Design an enzyme around this catalytic site. Sequence first.
Site, PDB file in Angstrom:
ATOM      1  N   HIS A 176      -2.141 -16.491 -19.775  1.00  0.00           N
ATOM      2  CA  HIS A 176      -1.015 -17.415 -19.572  1.00  0.00           C
ATOM      3  C   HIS A 176       0.210 -16.733 -18.984  1.00  0.00           C
ATOM      4  O   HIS A 176       1.256 -17.360 -18.854  1.00  0.00           O
ATOM      5  CB  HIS A 176      -0.632 -18.101 -20.877  1.00  0.00           C
ATOM      6  N   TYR A 354     -11.024 -20.565 -15.864  1.00  0.00           N
ATOM      7  CA  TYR A 354     -10.560 -19.989 -17.123  1.00  0.00           C
ATOM      8  C   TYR A 354     -10.179 -21.025 -18.187  1.00  0.00           C
ATOM      9  O   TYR A 354      -9.596 -20.669 -19.211  1.00  0.00           O
ATOM     10  CB  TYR A 354      -9.341 -19.074 -16.893  1.00  0.00           C
TER      11      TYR A 354
HETATM   12  C1  COH Z   1      -8.694 -18.812 -21.898  1.00  0.00           C
HETATM   13  C2  COH Z   1      -8.798 -19.313 -23.127  1.00  0.00           C
HETATM   14  C3  COH Z   1      -7.950 -20.516 -23.598  1.00  0.00           C
HETATM   15  C4  COH Z   1      -7.820 -20.851 -24.894  1.00  0.00           C
HETATM   16  C5  COH Z   1      -8.453 -20.116 -26.095  1.00  0.00           C
HETATM   17  C6  COH Z   1      -6.957 -22.011 -25.002  1.00  0.00           C
HETATM   18  C7  COH Z   1      -6.568 -22.652 -26.183  1.00  0.00           C
HETATM   19  C8  COH Z   1      -5.821 -23.823 -26.329  1.00  0.00           C
HETATM   20  C9  COH Z   1      -5.250 -24.426 -27.540  1.00  0.00           C
HETATM   21  C10 COH Z   1      -5.311 -23.950 -29.013  1.00  0.00           C
HETATM   22  C11 COH Z   1      -5.672 -22.716 -29.364  1.00  0.00           C
HETATM   23  C12 COH Z   1      -4.630 -25.556 -27.192  1.00  0.00           C
HETATM   24  C13 COH Z   1      -3.894 -26.495 -28.171  1.00  0.00           C
HETATM   25  C14 COH Z   1      -4.751 -25.727 -25.760  1.00  0.00           C
HETATM   26  C15 COH Z   1      -4.234 -26.750 -24.994  1.00  0.00           C
HETATM   27  C16 COH Z   1      -3.831 -26.628 -23.676  1.00  0.00           C
HETATM   28  N1  COH Z   1      -4.237 -25.635 -22.798  1.00  0.00           N
HETATM   29 CO1  COH Z   1      -5.577 -24.028 -23.257  1.00  0.00          CO
HETATM   30  N2  COH Z   1      -6.604 -22.345 -23.699  1.00  0.00           N
HETATM   31  C17 COH Z   1      -7.181 -21.467 -22.792  1.00  0.00           C
HETATM   32  C18 COH Z   1      -7.018 -21.528 -21.403  1.00  0.00           C
HETATM   33  C19 COH Z   1      -6.130 -22.324 -20.668  1.00  0.00           C
HETATM   34  C20 COH Z   1      -5.785 -22.206 -19.250  1.00  0.00           C
HETATM   35  C21 COH Z   1      -6.324 -21.172 -18.238  1.00  0.00           C
HETATM   36  C22 COH Z   1      -4.752 -23.319 -18.948  1.00  0.00           C
HETATM   37  C23 COH Z   1      -4.049 -23.682 -17.596  1.00  0.00           C
HETATM   38  C24 COH Z   1      -2.776 -22.899 -17.252  1.00  0.00           C
HETATM   39  C25 COH Z   1      -1.729 -23.643 -16.410  1.00  0.00           C
HETATM   40  O1  COH Z   1      -1.883 -24.004 -15.161  1.00  0.00           O
HETATM   41  O2  COH Z   1      -0.661 -23.854 -17.050  1.00  0.00           O
HETATM   42  C26 COH Z   1      -4.591 -24.007 -20.219  1.00  0.00           C
HETATM   43  C27 COH Z   1      -3.756 -25.092 -20.430  1.00  0.00           C
HETATM   44  C28 COH Z   1      -3.620 -25.855 -21.577  1.00  0.00           C
HETATM   45  C29 COH Z   1      -2.797 -27.042 -21.709  1.00  0.00           C
HETATM   46  C30 COH Z   1      -1.932 -27.651 -20.587  1.00  0.00           C
HETATM   47  C31 COH Z   1      -2.674 -28.842 -19.985  1.00  0.00           C
HETATM   48  C32 COH Z   1      -2.532 -28.822 -18.483  1.00  0.00           C
HETATM   49  O3  COH Z   1      -2.850 -29.855 -17.832  1.00  0.00           O
HETATM   50  O4  COH Z   1      -2.106 -27.763 -17.939  1.00  0.00           O
HETATM   51  C33 COH Z   1      -2.920 -27.505 -22.959  1.00  0.00           C
HETATM   52  C34 COH Z   1      -2.218 -28.753 -23.540  1.00  0.00           C
HETATM   53  N3  COH Z   1      -5.401 -23.396 -21.183  1.00  0.00           N
HETATM   54  N4  COH Z   1      -5.482 -24.657 -25.277  1.00  0.00           N
HETATM   55  C1  LIG Z   2     -14.580 -14.052 -16.349  1.00  0.00           C
HETATM   56  C2  LIG Z   2     -14.648 -12.556 -16.060  1.00  0.00           C
HETATM   57  C3  LIG Z   2     -16.008 -12.031 -16.414  1.00  0.00           C
HETATM   58  O1  LIG Z   2     -16.078 -10.656 -16.135  1.00  0.00           O
HETATM   59  C4  LIG Z   2     -17.205 -10.153 -16.813  1.00  0.00           C
HETATM   60  C5  LIG Z   2     -17.935  -9.194 -15.924  1.00  0.00           C
HETATM   61  O2  LIG Z   2     -16.992  -8.530 -15.103  1.00  0.00           O
HETATM   62  O3  LIG Z   2     -13.846 -11.684 -16.819  1.00  0.00           O
HETATM   63  C6  LIG Z   2     -12.709 -12.200 -17.440  1.00  0.00           C
HETATM   64  O4  LIG Z   2     -11.690 -12.255 -16.540  1.00  0.00           O
END
Ligand code: COH
Ligand SMILES: C[C@H](COCCO)OCO
EC number: 1.14.99.1
Lengths: 551, 551
Positions: A176, A354
């Site tokens: 993020h 992602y």
């Molecule tokens: C990579 C792992 C990961 C995890 C574990 C995670 C965990 C969680 C979590 C609780 C733990 C909640 C409540 C949310 C909820 C949200 N996430 Co994620 N997110 C993740 C990756 C992402 C990514 C990548 C974005 C988009 C980024 C952007 O453009 O702002 C995102 C964006 C969001 C948004 C914005 C919505 C939009 O349209 O941009 C919400 C709401 N979320 N997520």
């Molecule tokens: C999704 C990507 C996977 O990589 C694994 C092998 O390189 O890594 C995380 O950024």
Amino acid sequence: HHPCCSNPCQNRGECMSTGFDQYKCDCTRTGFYGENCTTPEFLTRIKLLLKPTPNTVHYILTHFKGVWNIVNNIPFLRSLIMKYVLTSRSYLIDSPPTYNVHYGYKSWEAFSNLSYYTRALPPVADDCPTPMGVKGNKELPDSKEVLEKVLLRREFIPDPQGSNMMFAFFAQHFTHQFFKTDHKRGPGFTRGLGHGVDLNHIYGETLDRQHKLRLFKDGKLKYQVIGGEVYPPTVKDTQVEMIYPPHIPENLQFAVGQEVFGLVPGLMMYATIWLREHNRVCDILKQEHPEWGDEQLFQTSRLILIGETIKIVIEDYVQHLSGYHFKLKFDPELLFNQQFQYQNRIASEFNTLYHWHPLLPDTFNIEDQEYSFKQFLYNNSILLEHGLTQFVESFTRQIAGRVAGGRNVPIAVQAVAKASIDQSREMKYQSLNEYRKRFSLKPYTSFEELTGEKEMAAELKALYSDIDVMELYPALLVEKPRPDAIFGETMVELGAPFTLKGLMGNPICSPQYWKPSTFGGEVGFKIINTASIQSLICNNVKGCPFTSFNV
Amino acid sequence: HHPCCSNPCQNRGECMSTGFDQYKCDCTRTGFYGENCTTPEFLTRIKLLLKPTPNTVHYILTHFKGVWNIVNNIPFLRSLIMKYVLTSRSYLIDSPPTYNVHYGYKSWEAFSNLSYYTRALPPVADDCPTPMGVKGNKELPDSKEVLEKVLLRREFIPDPQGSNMMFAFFAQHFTHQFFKTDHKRGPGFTRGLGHGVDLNHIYGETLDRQHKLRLFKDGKLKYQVIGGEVYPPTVKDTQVEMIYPPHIPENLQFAVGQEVFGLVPGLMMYATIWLREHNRVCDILKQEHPEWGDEQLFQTSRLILIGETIKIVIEDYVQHLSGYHFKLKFDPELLFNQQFQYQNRIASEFNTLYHWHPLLPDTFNIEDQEYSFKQFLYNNSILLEHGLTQFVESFTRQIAGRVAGGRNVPIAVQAVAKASIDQSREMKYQSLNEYRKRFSLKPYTSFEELTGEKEMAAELKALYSDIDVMELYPALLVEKPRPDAIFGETMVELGAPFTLKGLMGNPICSPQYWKPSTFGGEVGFKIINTASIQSLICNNVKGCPFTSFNV
Ligand code: COH
Ligand SMILES: C[C@H](COCCO)OCO
Ligand code: COH
Ligand SMILES: */O=C(/[C])[N][C]1[C](O[C]2[C]([C][O])O[C](*)[C]([N]C([C])=O)[C]2[O])O[C]([C][O])[C](O[C]2O[C]([C][O])[C]([O])[C]([O])[C]2[O])[C]1[O]
Ligand SMILES: *[C@@H]1O[C@H](CO)[C@@H](O[C@@H]2O[C@H](CO)[C@@H](O)[C@H](O)[C@H]2NC(C)=O)[C@H](O)[C@H]1NC(C)=O
Ligand SMILES: *[C@@H]1O[C@H](CO)[C@@H](O[C@@H]2O[C@H](CO)[C@@H](O)[C@H](O)[C@H]2NC(C)=O)[C@H](O)[C@H]1NC(C)=O
Ligand SMILES: CCCCCCCCO[C@@H]1O[C@H](CO)[C@@H](O)[C@H](O)[C@H]1O
Ligand SMILES: *[C@@H]1O[C@H](CO)[C@@H](O)[C@H](O)[C@H]1NC(C)=O
Ligand SMILES: *[C@@H]1O[C@H](CO)[C@@H](O)[C@H](O)[C@H]1NC(C)=O
Ligand SMILES: *[C@@H]1O[C@H](CO)[C@@H](O)[C@H](O)[C@H]1NC(C)=O
Ligand SMILES: C[C@H](COCCO)OCO
């Protein structure tokens, strides 16, 4: 309609209209020629015959443990193989970047305007007869229906690779800083103008925010001490804007670099750990440099933390995800006799791939409590109550969800998953199979081939009709995983080049930066080159609890 | 005081304080070691043995005209030598960039903040006991005395290389797209955030300004017709802000990309020529692409004009300045098998060395008139009165001033020259000999050696006392010129790497951009690869007058 709607040019050939009803493919340096860049040059023929598939190389890197144990301990060989890993992944990314959501052709606007995410494939033109260009029905299937039928979790599916909540929250916290979508402008826009690992999620995207977060003594970041424990300072104290519901008590409105990190105590855990790490590195540098002022202490600590971040991401985080027996290495020197561009622009598709929603558990299990999403969200009181040590111990033991393999998106975040689909469509993403070709993968020839099973594939077949108009994001989450793996082929083959490029592209990896004096001398340089997720926790969390990214 | 004040580290070694009174030099990859990075490795010894001096290489490149005539007609040979020219100059420029006026150590702030000019050498620390570090008197000599004694023009000294006013105004017009000092912030800051050849001086630095300059039909820029001739539109018409004195009438307030180009009719001449060129290329592209809309026509024309600009700067402008019998070549492909970074950051010292005040004549001679500076300044009536054809015929025949060799700054701009000196000091520039060493040149060991004569040297000696505290900017203007040349060794040896990096660093030179499809096909691509100062004038100036950069 645009004559390039069908995506006729293959093998990275570039398509250009030459009249209302005609196109031309520009096959320059593709290794192919002919109308659509599909006739291979002789050397290209040979190359293709010899090239092992991605699944073959994956097999090799995940077997023969005895052999990799020898390779790992012969520095020359380890360096040799890691050099190959870096260089082959990087060639897949355009750098300087090219397209974005508004430009399906190269333009000074698309190059220069950093508010855009860049695009690995140009958008489908506005006037194409179908969403994916010419193939498929006039409309894609209802996104709620795609979501409910093949994405929503029925019962929790754990990651067979053993990824834990330390991992899940590290992935969220780390990414993020460069996925910061500017929703005022649209999904194809970012607020992360550094486009990479600048640690704005700790220090702030702007100078104004950074300065509100800084102590201006000893290079350090402001903090507060609650029950004898160091936490980020408050919004009231710093006047740093954060997103919090109105009812959050003043002292729990923690202020950190990234305005959304109050959303989940798992993010604030890492925010707190990295804040402590910054101040710890300030203390070390002050010991080494009693003559230095606050500004140089602050800036040098930031460069060190950037290095530590990259170190950990490669040797712990990517290492864990990869499943390889080969030990990856962070070593900028490996590229110094290679062609490589020290710059990076964050791709929209990198953001999309992602969206690893399925990692999230059904509950967040800390100590003897099992918090629901409702209880966990915007609730820093949980962090205070249990403390960082217990957070680490608990999250290290809690397994995360499998990302590929289908039907594992928690219903609590169903709106986020649906938005990932809807926004891909608004941004006119090309199909899964176009992206597979773009990253040198064979197109799927059926839905069953995509999923490796029958039930979900039959649902997708009825929804989409043609595998060639299957969408990227739902495909990533339903794809057949590698054996006992968290991901399928497409996720890894797109994700790895974007990742390695975003890490190595950083200026601190360039030869004029990668030297001890950049980091305050050998002491600072060593902090980077010995960094690990275990030492990050050990240095900054009371009791030095054991941690890792696997249960 | 800062223990690196004496600039103790040699050979690009990096100095770091290690206590209040002690420093350490980081000799990484310098090819030297020892306390001050002065002990050469054996390889280094060998290199320095076979390394010809810049004066030797200059001699070779400016003699043997018959041999170079052969070389210029063997494309393989021409390519090989041009490749060497590009690569050897490149290594002298830090890319990604490092220091700036506020950061004498590497930092994320100096890397990321594009509002700064970068710095080839870090500033002298704030607490150093003398302006140049530890050498010299407590204050530098009065800048008025330096100016009056060795910089101000007595009799006009013409350029022996025959540079004309077409050349002098081209230099000003071209360089003012990336030297755009932000005086509200200070001399170390730029408004040119593109840091290179982006043609913002034609299209505007921001999108808002660009859109106000654009016609939004056929890809074109807005324009006006006066006496049947095309000129840039007005401020009133576009609402584009420009700098003009109050007494300029509405109809004479021409609006162009660069806010200051209304200052000088020679700048408006080129602004008008390039505006016409943009609209000409729009017409060509529309013929090739009747299916294209305004946006793609505009964007593609811009990329072509950027390509045209780089082409002309290398093959006409740098060609003329160089004095070489070797025919320089604009060919991005020369770098495709080389290590090279496709990015650029404008250095403050590159700006400073380009303050070529002595180029300016005592009067501006158009047709049978001789305009004074006061008559010529802010007076676009002169342009409308004589017309572009006469401007070109006249400025092609009027000789410009010699830049090196001393005493040739026109009195009309004495305050501008004094400001170059004063602002260098404000920005805490290191000495001439520090910059010489920084660019692999031998330090001058006397004032006489610097000037090649006795009288100005003895003045400077009385002013500065020590050759090692002589300042960069006045030394460029008094330096012994190469034989019958416009410049001395220091100007060329610093200016060429900065220039070739600023040109080749552009994304259009990168392999994913350098393809005919980027420029709308083979016809658009050929406009770039055949561009010249003569063709630019022939296509856009009534009558197609002959022109070149020499009289
Ligand atoms: C990579 C792992 C990961 C995890 C574990 C995670 C965990 C969680 C979590 C609780 C733990 C909640 C409540 C949310 C909820 C949200 N996430 Co994620 N997110 C993740 C990756 C992402 C990514 C990548 C974005 C988009 C980024 C952007 O453009 O702002 C995102 C964006 C969001 C948004 C914005 C919505 C939009 O349209 O941009 C919400 C709401 N979320 N997520
Ligand atoms: C999704 C990507 C996977 O990589 C694994 C092998 O390189 O890594 C995380 O950024
Ligand atoms: C390269 C040749 C060249 C020429 C021929 C030229 C011709 C002329 C000319 C009449 C034709 C006049 C009246 C001036 C007068 C000025 N020049 Co030039 N300038 C030139 C190169 C430069 C450069 C480079 C700068 C600094 C740009 C910045 O930071 O904006 C400059 C700056 C200036 C400034 C502002 C000072 C500052 O600190 O930026 C003035 C006033 N001047 N110049
Ligand atoms: O922010 C968005 C989505 N649109 C803005 C636009 O933003 C530019 C984006 C997208 O075009 O690209 C990158 C640019 N960044 C830089 C550094 O150039 C952004 O500026 O900017 C436009 C112009 O500033 C905005 O359009 C304006 O047009 C009208 C004036 O005629 C106004 O009435 C509009 O409300 C707006 O001010 C556009 O909103
Ligand atoms: C270039 O690509 C086009 C597709 O865009 C090819 O045309 C198709 O060819 C296939 C098989 O030959 C036919 O089944 C389709 O009906 C054709 N479609 C269209 C729209 O023409 C074309 O043959 C390719 N050119 C070459 C030389 O291979
Ligand atoms: C680049 O650096 C300059 C200089 O520090 C920044 O300009 C300052 O911005 C602060 C607020 O952030 C103002 O209070 C100062 O008045 C500004 N100083 C000067 C000299 O202009 C600028 O903000 C930085 N740019 C970015 C993108 O951070
Ligand atoms: C949390 C899951 C809620 C699903 C609500 C929409 C149901 C439509 O989805 C259906 O769900 C069934 C049960 O898994 C499957 O057997 C079907 O293949 C699937 O199409
Ligand atoms: C927040 O967490 C606390 C435990 O620290 C819990 O008791 C409380 O109910 C939670 N708040 C909400 C609104 O769920
Ligand atoms: C290094 O340079 C310093 C000047 O600061 C000088 O006093 C010292 O003798 C030099 N050391 C060596 C080993 O040459
Ligand atoms: C401007 O130029 C005109 C010639 O076109 C000249 O007659 C006039 O005097 C000039 N204005 C000034 C203020 O010198
Ligand atoms: C001053 C410098 C000299 O270039 C000549 C290259 O041999 O050019 C400026 O663009």
